[PDB]
């Protein structure tokens, strides 16, 4: 999604909620560092997933 | 400033990060109950009671 924290809420609403084992993650095509990984890494690892 | 600064801290709405560098430095002399609450610009305290 465009915006940081509405990335965050839905990964795992959609991801997690389907038994993933692991998760891929791509920098996104606008030229903005570290947006799309943060969120991910802060979500998944609380199970650490 | 006299005032308060309320800054865009609407969640769903927008994002900003830029302004929030200049908000340790007013945690560097906070003491309360004979004791020092002083925050190092890390984030933790520099001489606690332990």
Known sequence: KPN???????????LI?????????????????????????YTAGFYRI | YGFLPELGHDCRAQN???????????????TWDNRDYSFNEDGFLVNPSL
């Open chain 1, 4 to 14: 940081a924290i509405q990335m965050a809420l839905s990964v795992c609403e959609d």
């Open chain 1, 17 to 41: 909620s389907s038994q993933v084992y692991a998760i891929l993650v791509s920098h996104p095509p606008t030229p903005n560092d570290h947006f799309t990984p943060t969120p991910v890494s």
């Open chain 2, 16 to 30: 900003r990060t830029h302004r929030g560098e200049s908000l340790h430095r007013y945690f560097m002399n906070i």
